[PDB]
A = this chain, B = another copy of it.
Amino acid sequence: KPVSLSYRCPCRFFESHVARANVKHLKILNTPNCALQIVARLKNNNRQVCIDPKLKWIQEYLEKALNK
């Protein structure tokens, strides 16, 4: 094709030190079997970086988004 085994994972590396205050928004990619599905659009430089899905502030961020 070159032959590809289904969808390729967009996020291959992640950043562990990203502050909620420096995020314009998060994108949760619909790529189920990938280890990394979270992308952050940064405020300071407007660039996208994949972020550590285990960052504690992310859980809080999403809970508020769900009005839960």
Question: What is the interface of chain A, defined by CB distance below 8 A to chain B?
Answer: 20, 23-30, 32, 34-39, 41, 43, 53-54, 58-59, 61-62, 64-68
Q: How many copies of this chain sit in the oligomeric assembly?
A: 2
Which secondary structure dominates where chain A touches chain B? Answer: mixed
Measured between alpha carbons, how far is A8 from B39 in the docked complex, in Å?
23
A25 near B28 with CB under 8 A, answer yes
A26 near B23 with CB under 8 A, answer no
A-B contact pairs, 16 of them (CB 8 A): A24-B29, A24-B30, A25-B29, A25-B30, A25-B39, A26-B27, A26-B28, A28-B65, A30-B43, A32-B64, A35-B67, A35-B68, A37-B65, A53-B67, A59-B66, A59-B68
